[PDB]
Amino acid sequence: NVANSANLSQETKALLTEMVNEEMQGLSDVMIDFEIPLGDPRDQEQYIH
């Protein structure tokens, strides 16, 4: 979306993806990636799924 809004020319696109990747990796290096509880602990069908 950012590339289309601007007028990147197939060489500044690689300069943008690099920055996005490094920033997102820096953010992802300190997050544990768990799941949010939403239902009931007793139920077996959700856990099986």
Partner: protein, 53 residues
């Protein structure tokens, strides 16, 4: 010892050095001074017509 387990102390690196990565623009106009130098020495030669005749 007893129920508790003991672990060795960890050694620590004394210093760190920061060398961040930098984007490479790869511009082409720079380091083209030779072309300008070639432009400087055009050296057009013109011989007078009528002095010989």
């Amino acid at each position: 010892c007893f129920g508790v387990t003991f672990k060795k102390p960890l050694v620590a690196e004394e210093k760190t050095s920061l060398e961040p990565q930098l984007p490479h623009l790869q511009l082409r106009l720079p380091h083209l001074v030779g072309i300008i130098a070639k432009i400087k020495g055009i050296k057009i030669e013109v011989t007078s017509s009528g002095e010989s005749i």
